[PDB]
A paper describes a structure:
However, we did not find lactose bound in the Gal-13 R53H mutant, even when the crystallization buffer contains 50 mM lactose. Moreover, the C2, C3, O2, and O3 atoms of these two glycerol conformations occupy the same positions, whereas the C1 and O1 atoms are oriented differently. In this regard, the conformations of the two glycerol molecules in the R53H variant are different from those in Gal-3 and Gal-8.
Galectin-13 (Gal-13, a.k.a. placental protein 13 or PP13) was first isolated from human placenta, and its gene has been mapped to chromosome 19q13.1, which is in close proximity to the galectin-4, -7, -10 and 1412 genes. As with all other galectins, Gal-13 adopts the typical “jelly-roll” fold formed by sandwiching two anti-parallel β-sheets that consist of six (S1-S6) and five (F1-F5) β-strands and a short α-helix connecting strands S2 and F5.
Numbering used by the authors: 2 to 139
Amino acid sequence: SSLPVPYKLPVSLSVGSCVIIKGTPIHSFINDPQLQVDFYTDMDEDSDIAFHFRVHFGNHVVMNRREFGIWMLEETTDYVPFEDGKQFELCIYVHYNEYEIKVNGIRIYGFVHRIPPSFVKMVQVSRDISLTSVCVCN
């Protein structure tokens, strides 16, 4: 891994920002690896989460948010166009009303803001990936 995992990256996000995550799953899909990305409101792991994104490779993606310490209503999609054993590029684009999630250039979901994305102060990338690079662009 080029970067340690869990990878906790302090960030400042605004409308127009893009978080770009490149990495590779560390297990084959028959071993049910996962990838997780959390848009935290503070460096503290127990702080509120504006956008939680957990991929079960080869299966589905679960998304949620944590508000006042409470997990809210989970959202899911079965559209997970990651390839077994290959490097992926995950782009999370901050729009005025949602996070647009793209996997290998393919839009898979739009997760609507319930708090402003400018409240996000740390992005944590975790679980079963080797992390090649993480960029925040505008």
